[PDB]
Amino acid sequence: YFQGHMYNKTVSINLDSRCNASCDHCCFSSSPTSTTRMEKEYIRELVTEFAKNKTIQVISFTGGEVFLDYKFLKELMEIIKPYEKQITLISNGFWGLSKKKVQEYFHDMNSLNVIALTISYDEYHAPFVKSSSIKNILEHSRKYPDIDISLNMAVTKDKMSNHILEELGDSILGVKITKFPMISVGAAKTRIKQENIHKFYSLEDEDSLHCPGYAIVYHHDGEIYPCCSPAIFETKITLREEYNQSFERTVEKLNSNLLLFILRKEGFKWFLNILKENNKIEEFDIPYEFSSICGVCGSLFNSAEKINYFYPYMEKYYNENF
Amino acid sequence: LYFQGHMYNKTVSINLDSRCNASCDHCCFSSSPTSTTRMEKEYIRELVTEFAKNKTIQVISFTGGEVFLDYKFLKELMEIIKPYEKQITLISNGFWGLSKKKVQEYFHDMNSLNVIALTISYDEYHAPFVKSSSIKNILEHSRKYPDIDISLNMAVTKDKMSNHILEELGDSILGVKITKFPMISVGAAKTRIKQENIHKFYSLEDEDSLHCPGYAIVYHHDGEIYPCCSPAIFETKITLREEYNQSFERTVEKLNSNLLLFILRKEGFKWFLNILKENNKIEEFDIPYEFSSICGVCGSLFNSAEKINYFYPYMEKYYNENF
Ligand SMILES: Nc1ncnc2c1ncn2[C@@H]1O[C@H](CSCC[C@H](N)C(=O)O)[C@@H](O)[C@H]1O
Ligand SMILES: Nc1ncnc2c1ncn2[C@@H]1O[C@H](CSCC[C@H](N)C(=O)O)[C@@H](O)[C@H]1O
Ligand code: SF4
Ligand code: SF4
Ligand code: SF4
Ligand code: SF4
């Protein structure tokens, strides 16, 4: 039906860049002193709109650390509750230190339709959160089979989290664990040696270079991104045109965005072939090797000059097709 | 204009054979190269043809045994499904990863035959039968096929937690969903593993946490049809086959009209446990106080015709009160 929009069923909101941790890989460079965030009242309005929206099924919350201002998170989950939307959360699990706190939060999550909780723990998070805190959360989650539990571990060649998993003991039984490489963005750009980042892809294997898929995120910088990959936040791709924009308008802009249409239909080779034919790979600092497809994305579109360079080619594509 | 009809009709699993190249000490099926339990090949072709033609089934899953052992047969079944465009899932011990030719050829076939998920099982129990490098070859090659969801399932006990297994896989596990899970004490796990080494972190006190993970129809290699994928269901007297040539529509109808399973789903295990507790039947029914999974309660509640029949008057009362 031309505009079918298979992106209006989920939305993510990044509540704050503030975090109790200061992870050396952090794509947001989050820390207790981070000040980037949308205003609380503005977030209440966004959440109220997402709860009332008839197509949205799932609302996800991320940061930063969303459990740091738990009173506000619970307040937003209560706005959604009469509308019966599903909620997902991601956390560093610092709150797991008290088993009593873990029991209160799980009681709330279960009564507020939280269907998934992802806990991030690895050698990068370890200086900030104790292993026992993660174990308390993972162990208590067994009492709530309707909450899908995941453990996400960000790794490098020198920090593969092998001993982290062992210290977690049997608390990880039944938990989906995913170890993933670093995206070279934020604190990972300056605090991690590039040689320690796993390189799985190169500029020549163009057949594997396809975006995994779009998902709308209202970010703590006040912008709107087409996915939640750490790489996207340093790009200049935004779906925001004004302060008070509806989700119908955000979805319409995502579906009519020519760059994103070309990226989805043609893959990253359409853009890489333009830079290669114009001898711009070195001028635009495209890395030869990357840890993920998102690494190409971030390097192609992380400046106004780099994005604008494609505009005459996109205009030609629009005229040729359609 | 039609409210919700039958549930559990969007997926089906078929267990192709109990034969396997491995002889894992935990195996719920007691699979080995000498296992003879299996439905006939032609009978399976008919089942797969019916599932492919079926209007509601979206996903067809294959398991064993080791389904890649008789690759020619598996590929034939996947080819029957192909014109109907159903999604397929596979689970394997990955013994075929030792051969680079098999890895390339099998991934090409899976991608062209709409295989959306492949689960590889590797742990200390599988390790004597399949080399680590074989698993590594499969995981590494899977990166070239991003539309195939890859999972690593590791069966563990207190004495065999598979800690070194993960380390020796290196970075081939990056992006792979790993799940370590405890044992269900069925099959070879009943006699070859000490009960003390099986994790038992679920209890009866977690009454509100006692819910069945969900029903999924399984056409098993013993020729029976089961309402779920748990190794524990085989020991219950809960089955879905009434005759040799039974349609999938009939299997679904039987599952949806099973009053015990309706009550179990809607009310949870506490409905049955509360009846036992009120009449002091927990010890008479050998209900364990601790268990590795909720399926452990299931197995103990319904493992005899007399236990199932004990609930009949209460379920009849429930049907009359509700509906
Ligand atoms: N440079 C980077 N590359 C890859 N993953 C990164 C990253 N920076 C952060 N992440 C991951 O992005 C996820 C969300 S971070 C925000 C949620 C919360 N503070 C948490 O840590 O879970 C975490 O799993 C984190 O490890
Ligand atoms: N007693 C038991 N308890 C729990 N999981 C078991 C089990 N016996 C077998 N399994 C698991 O059931 C799954 C399917 S076994 C059949 C598929 C294939 N041979 C394979 O090993 O993957 C495997 O992950 C296996 O480890
Ligand atoms: S990765 Fe998560 S826990 Fe670590 S600094 Fe970033 S926001 Fe905080
Ligand atoms: S390829 Fe680009 S748009 Fe697609 S998920 Fe990765 S960063 Fe986002
Ligand atoms: S667990 Fe899988 S690989 Fe091991 S014996 Fe059983 S069927 Fe074979
Ligand atoms: S609780 Fe019973 S019916 Fe449900 S999956 Fe486990 S064994 Fe099967």
PDB file of N, CA, C and O in Angstrom, chain B residues 62-127:
ATOM      1  N   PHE B  62      12.688 -29.191  12.602  1.00  0.00           N
ATOM      2  CA  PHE B  62      13.173 -30.556  12.526  1.00  0.00           C
ATOM      3  C   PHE B  62      14.175 -30.809  13.645  1.00  0.00           C
ATOM      4  O   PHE B  62      15.044 -29.981  13.926  1.00  0.00           O
ATOM      5  N   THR B  63      14.059 -31.973  14.266  1.00  0.00           N
ATOM      6  CA  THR B  63      14.950 -32.386  15.343  1.00  0.00           C
ATOM      7  C   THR B  63      15.115 -33.917  15.323  1.00  0.00           C
ATOM      8  O   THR B  63      14.485 -34.595  14.512  1.00  0.00           O
ATOM      9  N   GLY B  64      15.993 -34.445  16.167  1.00  0.00           N
ATOM     10  CA  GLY B  64      16.251 -35.873  16.257  1.00  0.00           C
ATOM     11  C   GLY B  64      16.576 -36.231  17.691  1.00  0.00           C
ATOM     12  O   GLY B  64      15.875 -35.782  18.586  1.00  0.00           O
ATOM     13  N   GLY B  65      17.642 -36.995  17.928  1.00  0.00           N
ATOM     14  CA  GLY B  65      18.527 -37.507  16.885  1.00  0.00           C
ATOM     15  C   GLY B  65      19.355 -36.421  16.215  1.00  0.00           C
ATOM     16  O   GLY B  65      19.251 -35.240  16.574  1.00  0.00           O
ATOM     17  N   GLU B  66      20.162 -36.803  15.218  1.00  0.00           N
ATOM     18  CA  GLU B  66      20.933 -35.830  14.473  1.00  0.00           C
ATOM     19  C   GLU B  66      20.359 -35.744  13.065  1.00  0.00           C
ATOM     20  O   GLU B  66      20.554 -36.670  12.279  1.00  0.00           O
ATOM     21  N   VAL B  67      19.633 -34.656  12.742  1.00  0.00           N
ATOM     22  CA  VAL B  67      18.995 -34.529  11.430  1.00  0.00           C
ATOM     23  C   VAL B  67      19.970 -34.414  10.268  1.00  0.00           C
ATOM     24  O   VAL B  67      19.592 -34.767   9.150  1.00  0.00           O
ATOM     25  N   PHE B  68      21.202 -33.939  10.506  1.00  0.00           N
ATOM     26  CA  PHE B  68      22.183 -33.842   9.412  1.00  0.00           C
ATOM     27  C   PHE B  68      22.897 -35.184   9.106  1.00  0.00           C
ATOM     28  O   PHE B  68      23.707 -35.256   8.197  1.00  0.00           O
ATOM     29  N   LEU B  69      22.608 -36.234   9.872  1.00  0.00           N
ATOM     30  CA  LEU B  69      23.207 -37.547   9.665  1.00  0.00           C
ATOM     31  C   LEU B  69      22.708 -38.123   8.332  1.00  0.00           C
ATOM     32  O   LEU B  69      23.506 -38.657   7.553  1.00  0.00           O
ATOM     33  N   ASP B  70      21.406 -37.982   8.046  1.00  0.00           N
ATOM     34  CA  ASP B  70      20.856 -38.435   6.777  1.00  0.00           C
ATOM     35  C   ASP B  70      20.467 -37.163   6.064  1.00  0.00           C
ATOM     36  O   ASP B  70      19.292 -36.805   6.009  1.00  0.00           O
ATOM     37  N   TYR B  71      21.473 -36.434   5.601  1.00  0.00           N
ATOM     38  CA  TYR B  71      21.297 -35.162   4.938  1.00  0.00           C
ATOM     39  C   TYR B  71      20.377 -35.220   3.733  1.00  0.00           C
ATOM     40  O   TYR B  71      19.574 -34.315   3.534  1.00  0.00           O
ATOM     41  N   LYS B  72      20.518 -36.268   2.920  1.00  0.00           N
ATOM     42  CA  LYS B  72      19.743 -36.483   1.707  1.00  0.00           C
ATOM     43  C   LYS B  72      18.236 -36.460   2.018  1.00  0.00           C
ATOM     44  O   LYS B  72      17.481 -35.773   1.329  1.00  0.00           O
ATOM     45  N   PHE B  73      17.827 -37.134   3.099  1.00  0.00           N
ATOM     46  CA  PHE B  73      16.437 -37.141   3.540  1.00  0.00           C
ATOM     47  C   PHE B  73      15.963 -35.759   4.024  1.00  0.00           C
ATOM     48  O   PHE B  73      14.903 -35.295   3.602  1.00  0.00           O
ATOM     49  N   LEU B  74      16.768 -35.082   4.866  1.00  0.00           N
ATOM     50  CA  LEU B  74      16.461 -33.742   5.364  1.00  0.00           C
ATOM     51  C   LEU B  74      16.275 -32.757   4.207  1.00  0.00           C
ATOM     52  O   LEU B  74      15.288 -32.020   4.174  1.00  0.00           O
ATOM     53  N   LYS B  75      17.197 -32.784   3.222  1.00  0.00           N
ATOM     54  CA  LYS B  75      17.106 -31.893   2.073  1.00  0.00           C
ATOM     55  C   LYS B  75      15.849 -32.195   1.249  1.00  0.00           C
ATOM     56  O   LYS B  75      15.163 -31.269   0.807  1.00  0.00           O
ATOM     57  N   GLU B  76      15.497 -33.472   1.110  1.00  0.00           N
ATOM     58  CA  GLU B  76      14.272 -33.844   0.418  1.00  0.00           C
ATOM     59  C   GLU B  76      13.031 -33.244   1.101  1.00  0.00           C
ATOM     60  O   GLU B  76      12.166 -32.685   0.422  1.00  0.00           O
ATOM     61  N   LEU B  77      12.967 -33.322   2.452  1.00  0.00           N
ATOM     62  CA  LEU B  77      11.848 -32.769   3.208  1.00  0.00           C
ATOM     63  C   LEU B  77      11.793 -31.232   3.073  1.00  0.00           C
ATOM     64  O   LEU B  77      10.713 -30.664   2.868  1.00  0.00           O
ATOM     65  N   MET B  78      12.951 -30.573   3.122  1.00  0.00           N
ATOM     66  CA  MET B  78      13.021 -29.124   2.938  1.00  0.00           C
ATOM     67  C   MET B  78      12.564 -28.733   1.521  1.00  0.00           C
ATOM     68  O   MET B  78      11.960 -27.674   1.348  1.00  0.00           O
ATOM     69  N   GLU B  79      12.827 -29.594   0.520  1.00  0.00           N
ATOM     70  CA  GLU B  79      12.407 -29.328  -0.858  1.00  0.00           C
ATOM     71  C   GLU B  79      10.883 -29.484  -1.003  1.00  0.00           C
ATOM     72  O   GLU B  79      10.277 -28.795  -1.822  1.00  0.00           O
ATOM     73  N   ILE B  80      10.256 -30.375  -0.207  1.00  0.00           N
ATOM     74  CA  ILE B  80       8.795 -30.539  -0.253  1.00  0.00           C
ATOM     75  C   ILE B  80       8.142 -29.211   0.221  1.00  0.00           C
ATOM     76  O   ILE B  80       7.191 -28.725  -0.389  1.00  0.00           O
ATOM     77  N   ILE B  81       8.705 -28.608   1.272  1.00  0.00           N
ATOM     78  CA  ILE B  81       8.218 -27.373   1.856  1.00  0.00           C
ATOM     79  C   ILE B  81       8.422 -26.154   0.960  1.00  0.00           C
ATOM     80  O   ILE B  81       7.548 -25.298   0.909  1.00  0.00           O
ATOM     81  N   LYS B  82       9.573 -26.062   0.276  1.00  0.00           N
ATOM     82  CA  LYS B  82       9.968 -24.929  -0.562  1.00  0.00           C
ATOM     83  C   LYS B  82       8.850 -24.285  -1.412  1.00  0.00           C
ATOM     84  O   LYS B  82       8.681 -23.076  -1.262  1.00  0.00           O
ATOM     85  N   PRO B  83       8.076 -24.991  -2.284  1.00  0.00           N
ATOM     86  CA  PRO B  83       7.035 -24.282  -3.068  1.00  0.00           C
ATOM     87  C   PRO B  83       5.948 -23.614  -2.216  1.00  0.00           C
ATOM     88  O   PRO B  83       5.270 -22.698  -2.671  1.00  0.00           O
ATOM     89  N   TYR B  84       5.788 -24.070  -0.982  1.00  0.00           N
ATOM     90  CA  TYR B  84       4.803 -23.537  -0.050  1.00  0.00           C
ATOM     91  C   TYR B  84       5.318 -22.379   0.812  1.00  0.00           C
ATOM     92  O   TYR B  84       4.534 -21.759   1.534  1.00  0.00           O
ATOM     93  N   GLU B  85       6.631 -22.098   0.738  1.00  0.00           N
ATOM     94  CA  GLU B  85       7.322 -20.996   1.400  1.00  0.00           C
ATOM     95  C   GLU B  85       7.144 -20.946   2.915  1.00  0.00           C
ATOM     96  O   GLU B  85       7.034 -19.855   3.477  1.00  0.00           O
ATOM     97  N   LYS B  86       7.155 -22.106   3.587  1.00  0.00           N
ATOM     98  CA  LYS B  86       7.100 -22.100   5.053  1.00  0.00           C
ATOM     99  C   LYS B  86       8.518 -21.841   5.596  1.00  0.00           C
ATOM    100  O   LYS B  86       9.498 -22.076   4.890  1.00  0.00           O
ATOM    101  N   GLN B  87       8.615 -21.307   6.811  1.00  0.00           N
ATOM    102  CA  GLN B  87       9.897 -21.084   7.480  1.00  0.00           C
ATOM    103  C   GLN B  87      10.330 -22.390   8.119  1.00  0.00           C
ATOM    104  O   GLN B  87       9.481 -23.125   8.625  1.00  0.00           O
ATOM    105  N   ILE B  88      11.630 -22.687   8.125  1.00  0.00           N
ATOM    106  CA  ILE B  88      12.117 -23.932   8.735  1.00  0.00           C
ATOM    107  C   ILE B  88      13.144 -23.624   9.828  1.00  0.00           C
ATOM    108  O   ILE B  88      13.896 -22.646   9.707  1.00  0.00           O
ATOM    109  N   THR B  89      13.158 -24.413  10.910  1.00  0.00           N
ATOM    110  CA  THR B  89      14.223 -24.270  11.918  1.00  0.00           C
ATOM    111  C   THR B  89      14.896 -25.638  12.051  1.00  0.00           C
ATOM    112  O   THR B  89      14.255 -26.681  11.849  1.00  0.00           O
ATOM    113  N   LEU B  90      16.187 -25.634  12.374  1.00  0.00           N
ATOM    114  CA  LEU B  90      16.953 -26.866  12.529  1.00  0.00           C
ATOM    115  C   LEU B  90      17.764 -26.814  13.810  1.00  0.00           C
ATOM    116  O   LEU B  90      18.140 -25.739  14.289  1.00  0.00           O
ATOM    117  N   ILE B  91      18.026 -27.984  14.372  1.00  0.00           N
ATOM    118  CA  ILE B  91      18.890 -28.100  15.536  1.00  0.00           C
ATOM    119  C   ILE B  91      19.852 -29.243  15.265  1.00  0.00           C
ATOM    120  O   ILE B  91      19.446 -30.272  14.707  1.00  0.00           O
ATOM    121  N   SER B  92      21.131 -29.052  15.608  1.00  0.00           N
ATOM    122  CA  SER B  92      22.126 -30.033  15.264  1.00  0.00           C
ATOM    123  C   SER B  92      23.291 -30.030  16.242  1.00  0.00           C
ATOM    124  O   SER B  92      23.594 -29.008  16.846  1.00  0.00           O
ATOM    125  N   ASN B  93      23.957 -31.162  16.377  1.00  0.00           N
ATOM    126  CA  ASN B  93      25.201 -31.238  17.159  1.00  0.00           C
ATOM    127  C   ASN B  93      26.413 -30.683  16.343  1.00  0.00           C
ATOM    128  O   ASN B  93      27.542 -30.624  16.845  1.00  0.00           O
ATOM    129  N   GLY B  94      26.186 -30.302  15.089  1.00  0.00           N
ATOM    130  CA  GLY B  94      27.226 -29.715  14.254  1.00  0.00           C
ATOM    131  C   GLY B  94      28.396 -30.613  13.911  1.00  0.00           C
ATOM    132  O   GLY B  94      29.470 -30.101  13.570  1.00  0.00           O
ATOM    133  N   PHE B  95      28.206 -31.965  13.924  1.00  0.00           N
ATOM    134  CA  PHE B  95      29.319 -32.874  13.573  1.00  0.00           C
ATOM    135  C   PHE B  95      29.834 -32.592  12.153  1.00  0.00           C
ATOM    136  O   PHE B  95      30.998 -32.811  11.862  1.00  0.00           O
ATOM    137  N   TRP B  96      28.945 -32.120  11.269  1.00  0.00           N
ATOM    138  CA  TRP B  96      29.232 -31.804   9.879  1.00  0.00           C
ATOM    139  C   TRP B  96      30.183 -30.606   9.688  1.00  0.00           C
ATOM    140  O   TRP B  96      30.639 -30.383   8.572  1.00  0.00           O
ATOM    141  N   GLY B  97      30.504 -29.871  10.758  1.00  0.00           N
ATOM    142  CA  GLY B  97      31.441 -28.756  10.702  1.00  0.00           C
ATOM    143  C   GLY B  97      32.902 -29.137  10.489  1.00  0.00           C
ATOM    144  O   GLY B  97      33.749 -28.280  10.241  1.00  0.00           O
ATOM    145  N   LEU B  98      33.222 -30.411  10.619  1.00  0.00           N
ATOM    146  CA  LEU B  98      34.583 -30.919  10.425  1.00  0.00           C
ATOM    147  C   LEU B  98      34.983 -30.809   8.928  1.00  0.00           C
ATOM    148  O   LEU B  98      36.146 -30.597   8.594  1.00  0.00           O
ATOM    149  N   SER B  99      33.971 -30.938   8.028  1.00  0.00           N
ATOM    150  CA  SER B  99      34.065 -30.857   6.576  1.00  0.00           C
ATOM    151  C   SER B  99      33.724 -29.443   6.083  1.00  0.00           C
ATOM    152  O   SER B  99      32.578 -29.004   6.194  1.00  0.00           O
ATOM    153  N   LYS B 100      34.702 -28.752   5.484  1.00  0.00           N
ATOM    154  CA  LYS B 100      34.491 -27.414   4.933  1.00  0.00           C
ATOM    155  C   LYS B 100      33.504 -27.404   3.752  1.00  0.00           C
ATOM    156  O   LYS B 100      32.786 -26.419   3.541  1.00  0.00           O
ATOM    157  N   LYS B 101      33.479 -28.503   2.990  1.00  0.00           N
ATOM    158  CA  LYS B 101      32.583 -28.718   1.856  1.00  0.00           C
ATOM    159  C   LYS B 101      31.171 -28.787   2.384  1.00  0.00           C
ATOM    160  O   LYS B 101      30.293 -28.148   1.813  1.00  0.00           O
ATOM    161  N   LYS B 102      30.943 -29.555   3.472  1.00  0.00           N
ATOM    162  CA  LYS B 102      29.623 -29.663   4.087  1.00  0.00           C
ATOM    163  C   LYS B 102      29.183 -28.320   4.623  1.00  0.00           C
ATOM    164  O   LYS B 102      28.067 -27.918   4.342  1.00  0.00           O
ATOM    165  N   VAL B 103      30.044 -27.585   5.331  1.00  0.00           N
ATOM    166  CA  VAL B 103      29.671 -26.259   5.850  1.00  0.00           C
ATOM    167  C   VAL B 103      29.161 -25.323   4.726  1.00  0.00           C
ATOM    168  O   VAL B 103      28.063 -24.776   4.829  1.00  0.00           O
ATOM    169  N   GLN B 104      29.920 -25.217   3.624  1.00  0.00           N
ATOM    170  CA  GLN B 104      29.546 -24.349   2.500  1.00  0.00           C
ATOM    171  C   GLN B 104      28.230 -24.826   1.844  1.00  0.00           C
ATOM    172  O   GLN B 104      27.288 -24.047   1.675  1.00  0.00           O
ATOM    173  N   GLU B 105      28.163 -26.103   1.531  1.00  0.00           N
ATOM    174  CA  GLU B 105      27.017 -26.684   0.864  1.00  0.00           C
ATOM    175  C   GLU B 105      25.766 -26.608   1.730  1.00  0.00           C
ATOM    176  O   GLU B 105      24.709 -26.234   1.236  1.00  0.00           O
ATOM    177  N   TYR B 106      25.869 -26.949   3.005  1.00  0.00           N
ATOM    178  CA  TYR B 106      24.719 -26.951   3.905  1.00  0.00           C
ATOM    179  C   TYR B 106      24.169 -25.558   4.133  1.00  0.00           C
ATOM    180  O   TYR B 106      22.949 -25.381   4.097  1.00  0.00           O
ATOM    181  N   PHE B 107      25.048 -24.562   4.308  1.00  0.00           N
ATOM    182  CA  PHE B 107      24.598 -23.185   4.486  1.00  0.00           C
ATOM    183  C   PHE B 107      23.926 -22.659   3.225  1.00  0.00           C
ATOM    184  O   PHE B 107      22.945 -21.925   3.314  1.00  0.00           O
ATOM    185  N   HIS B 108      24.442 -23.051   2.041  1.00  0.00           N
ATOM    186  CA  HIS B 108      23.836 -22.644   0.774  1.00  0.00           C
ATOM    187  C   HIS B 108      22.414 -23.202   0.674  1.00  0.00           C
ATOM    188  O   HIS B 108      21.484 -22.491   0.295  1.00  0.00           O
ATOM    189  N   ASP B 109      22.252 -24.461   1.043  1.00  0.00           N
ATOM    190  CA  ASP B 109      20.954 -25.112   1.032  1.00  0.00           C
ATOM    191  C   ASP B 109      19.995 -24.500   2.027  1.00  0.00           C
ATOM    192  O   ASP B 109      18.872 -24.209   1.652  1.00  0.00           O
ATOM    193  N   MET B 110      20.427 -24.283   3.270  1.00  0.00           N
ATOM    194  CA  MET B 110      19.582 -23.711   4.327  1.00  0.00           C
ATOM    195  C   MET B 110      19.089 -22.319   3.922  1.00  0.00           C
ATOM    196  O   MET B 110      17.909 -22.015   4.071  1.00  0.00           O
ATOM    197  N   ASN B 111      19.977 -21.503   3.357  1.00  0.00           N
ATOM    198  CA  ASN B 111      19.606 -20.164   2.927  1.00  0.00           C
ATOM    199  C   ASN B 111      18.614 -20.188   1.779  1.00  0.00           C
ATOM    200  O   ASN B 111      17.680 -19.377   1.760  1.00  0.00           O
ATOM    201  N   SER B 112      18.771 -21.136   0.851  1.00  0.00           N
ATOM    202  CA  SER B 112      17.855 -21.215  -0.286  1.00  0.00           C
ATOM    203  C   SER B 112      16.562 -21.969   0.030  1.00  0.00           C
ATOM    204  O   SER B 112      15.639 -21.911  -0.774  1.00  0.00           O
ATOM    205  N   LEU B 113      16.490 -22.678   1.175  1.00  0.00           N
ATOM    206  CA  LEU B 113      15.300 -23.443   1.549  1.00  0.00           C
ATOM    207  C   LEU B 113      14.515 -22.831   2.726  1.00  0.00           C
ATOM    208  O   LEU B 113      13.714 -23.535   3.361  1.00  0.00           O
ATOM    209  N   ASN B 114      14.725 -21.524   2.983  1.00  0.00           N
ATOM    210  CA  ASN B 114      14.050 -20.730   3.997  1.00  0.00           C
ATOM    211  C   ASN B 114      14.260 -21.220   5.439  1.00  0.00           C
ATOM    212  O   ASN B 114      13.331 -21.192   6.249  1.00  0.00           O
ATOM    213  N   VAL B 115      15.485 -21.641   5.758  1.00  0.00           N
ATOM    214  CA  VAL B 115      15.827 -21.987   7.128  1.00  0.00           C
ATOM    215  C   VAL B 115      16.096 -20.639   7.815  1.00  0.00           C
ATOM    216  O   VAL B 115      16.968 -19.876   7.375  1.00  0.00           O
ATOM    217  N   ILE B 116      15.288 -20.289   8.824  1.00  0.00           N
ATOM    218  CA  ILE B 116      15.442 -19.004   9.505  1.00  0.00           C
ATOM    219  C   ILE B 116      16.225 -19.109  10.799  1.00  0.00           C
ATOM    220  O   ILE B 116      16.571 -18.075  11.356  1.00  0.00           O
ATOM    221  N   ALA B 117      16.482 -20.332  11.302  1.00  0.00           N
ATOM    222  CA  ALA B 117      17.174 -20.488  12.559  1.00  0.00           C
ATOM    223  C   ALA B 117      17.874 -21.803  12.585  1.00  0.00           C
ATOM    224  O   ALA B 117      17.315 -22.828  12.186  1.00  0.00           O
ATOM    225  N   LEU B 118      19.078 -21.787  13.106  1.00  0.00           N
ATOM    226  CA  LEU B 118      19.857 -22.992  13.283  1.00  0.00           C
ATOM    227  C   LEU B 118      20.428 -22.948  14.683  1.00  0.00           C
ATOM    228  O   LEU B 118      21.119 -21.985  15.064  1.00  0.00           O
ATOM    229  N   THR B 119      20.136 -23.977  15.467  1.00  0.00           N
ATOM    230  CA  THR B 119      20.669 -24.088  16.815  1.00  0.00           C
ATOM    231  C   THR B 119      21.736 -25.158  16.811  1.00  0.00           C
ATOM    232  O   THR B 119      21.512 -26.249  16.304  1.00  0.00           O
ATOM    233  N   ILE B 120      22.888 -24.865  17.391  1.00  0.00           N
ATOM    234  CA  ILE B 120      23.967 -25.828  17.510  1.00  0.00           C
ATOM    235  C   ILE B 120      24.078 -26.171  18.981  1.00  0.00           C
ATOM    236  O   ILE B 120      24.128 -25.267  19.800  1.00  0.00           O
ATOM    237  N   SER B 121      24.130 -27.474  19.323  1.00  0.00           N
ATOM    238  CA  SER B 121      24.280 -27.886  20.694  1.00  0.00           C
ATOM    239  C   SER B 121      25.736 -28.286  20.928  1.00  0.00           C
ATOM    240  O   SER B 121      26.255 -29.151  20.228  1.00  0.00           O
ATOM    241  N   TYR B 122      26.398 -27.657  21.883  1.00  0.00           N
ATOM    242  CA  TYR B 122      27.771 -28.008  22.222  1.00  0.00           C
ATOM    243  C   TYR B 122      27.959 -27.764  23.691  1.00  0.00           C
ATOM    244  O   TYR B 122      27.489 -26.756  24.214  1.00  0.00           O
ATOM    245  N   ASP B 123      28.624 -28.700  24.361  1.00  0.00           N
ATOM    246  CA  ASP B 123      28.856 -28.666  25.801  1.00  0.00           C
ATOM    247  C   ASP B 123      29.781 -29.826  26.170  1.00  0.00           C
ATOM    248  O   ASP B 123      30.219 -30.551  25.273  1.00  0.00           O
ATOM    249  N   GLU B 124      30.069 -30.042  27.472  1.00  0.00           N
ATOM    250  CA  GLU B 124      30.949 -31.152  27.889  1.00  0.00           C
ATOM    251  C   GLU B 124      30.370 -32.539  27.610  1.00  0.00           C
ATOM    252  O   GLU B 124      31.117 -33.504  27.539  1.00  0.00           O
ATOM    253  N   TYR B 125      29.055 -32.630  27.450  1.00  0.00           N
ATOM    254  CA  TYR B 125      28.363 -33.878  27.155  1.00  0.00           C
ATOM    255  C   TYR B 125      28.493 -34.275  25.695  1.00  0.00           C
ATOM    256  O   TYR B 125      28.576 -35.478  25.389  1.00  0.00           O
ATOM    257  N   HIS B 126      28.502 -33.266  24.790  1.00  0.00           N
ATOM    258  CA  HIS B 126      28.662 -33.465  23.350  1.00  0.00           C
ATOM    259  C   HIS B 126      30.154 -33.512  22.953  1.00  0.00           C
ATOM    260  O   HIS B 126      30.499 -34.123  21.946  1.00  0.00           O
ATOM    261  N   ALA B 127      31.024 -32.840  23.718  1.00  0.00           N
ATOM    262  CA  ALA B 127      32.448 -32.730  23.415  1.00  0.00           C
ATOM    263  C   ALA B 127      33.160 -34.056  23.074  1.00  0.00           C
ATOM    264  O   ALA B 127      33.971 -34.016  22.143  1.00  0.00           O
TER     265      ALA B 127
END
